[PDB]
C-alpha cells in the first residue's frame, strides 16, 4: 500500500514523555522497512515478543500503538512481561502475554544537562500496581503513614512524582534511555 508509516514522528520526536505520563501514538495502514529501524546504530535493545520484527513491514491492514517515554538505563529491564520494580509496578506495565516489540537507546546526549535535567519524572508510590497499559497521571499527595495529608507534603505524606537526575556524568545505568514499545490493537 506504498504510503510510509510515520515512525519518525515517534522515534525522532525531540521531546519525549515522562514515563508516568507515557505517550501513546497510533500507526496504522501503512508500509515500512523494519531494517532501517532495526539496524539503527543508536539502539541497544530491539526485542520482539510473540512476533517477528519483519511483521513491521506490512501494516497495510493493521493498527499499531507506539508508546514512548524516558527512564534510567538500569530500568529498561523492567519494560518486559512479568517484571516488577517501580517502573513496572507504578509507571508503565506490559501484560504477561505481551506481543510486540521493545526498543531502547541511550539518550544522554539529548536528555542530560550540565546542571541536571529535572524535567523527566517517575511515580514513586501508589496504593496498588498498574494494570497492563494503564496510565496514572494523578498528582494526589500519597499518604504513607497514619495521618491524613490534607493536600500538602507532610512528615509521611509525599508528593508521588520524583524527578530523575540525569547529570551527563552519571554512570550508564543512571543515564536517560528513550524507550519505544510497539504493540497491536484490534
Amino acid at each position: 500500500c506504498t504510503n510510509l508509516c510515520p515512525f519518525g514522528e515517534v522515534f525522532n520526536a525531540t521531546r519525549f514523555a515522562s514515563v508516568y505520563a507515557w505517550n501513546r501514538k497510533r500507526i496504522s495502514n501503512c508500509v515500512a522497512d523494519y531494517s532501517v529501524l532495526y539496524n539503527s546504530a543508536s539502539f541497544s535493545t530491539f526485542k520482539c515478543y510473540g512476533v517477528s520484527p519483519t511483521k513491521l513491514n506490512d501494516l497495510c491492514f493493521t493498527n499499531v500503538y507506539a508508546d514512548s517515554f524516558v527512564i534510567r538505563g538500569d530500568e529498561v529491564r523492567q519494560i518486559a512481561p512479568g517484571q516488577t520494580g517501580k517502573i513496572a509496578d507504578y509507571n508503565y506495565k506490559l501484560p504477561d502475554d505481551f506481543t510486540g516489540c521493545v526498543i531502547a537507546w541511550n539518550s544522554n546526549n539529548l536528555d542530560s544537562k550540565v546542571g541536571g535535567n529535572y524535567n523527566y519524572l517517575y511515580r514513586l508510590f501508589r496504593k496498588s500496581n498498574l494494570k497492563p497499559f494503564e496510565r496514572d497521571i494523578s498528582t494526589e499527595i500519597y499518604q504513607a503513614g497514619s495521618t491524613p495529608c490534607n493536600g500538602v507534603e507532610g512528615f509521611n505524606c509525599y508528593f508521588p512524582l520524583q524527578s530523575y537526575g540525569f547529570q551527563p556524568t552519571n554512570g550508564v545505568g543512571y543515564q536517560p534511555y528513550r524507550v519505544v514499545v510497539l504493540s497491536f490493537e484490534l
Partner: nanobody
Amino acid sequence: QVQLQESGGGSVQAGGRLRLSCAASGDTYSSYCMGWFRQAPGKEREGVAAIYIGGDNTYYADSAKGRFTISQDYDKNTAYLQMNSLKSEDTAMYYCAAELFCPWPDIGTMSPAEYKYWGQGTQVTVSS
C-alpha cells in the same frame, strides 16, 4: 468488563439546549478516554467530542466547536456533553463510548466510534 449507562436525550427546538450524561462502571482505569459519536438514519457514524477522564484533554469535531462542551466528574467516572445552539442537522442517535487504551495526549486521532465500549444510544431530535 466496563459498562456505560447513558442519560438524557429527547426533542429540542432549534436554538435550544440539551445535556447528555455517560457514567462508566466496572473495571475502568485510572485515566481513559470517553466520548460520543452520532449516527443519522442512512448515514455513517461520526465522532462528536472526546475527553480524557483523569486529565484535561478534550477534542471536538468541527461540527461541534463553539456549540458543544464536553466535561467530566472524575470521582463519579462520568462525562457530560452539553449541546447548545442545536440545529436540525444535529438530529441523530447519540452514543457514548469508552476506551481504556486510546492514544494520548493526542486523543483527537481516534474516533469514539472505534472505541471498544459503546452505550445503548439515545435519540436527539432537533426540529425547525
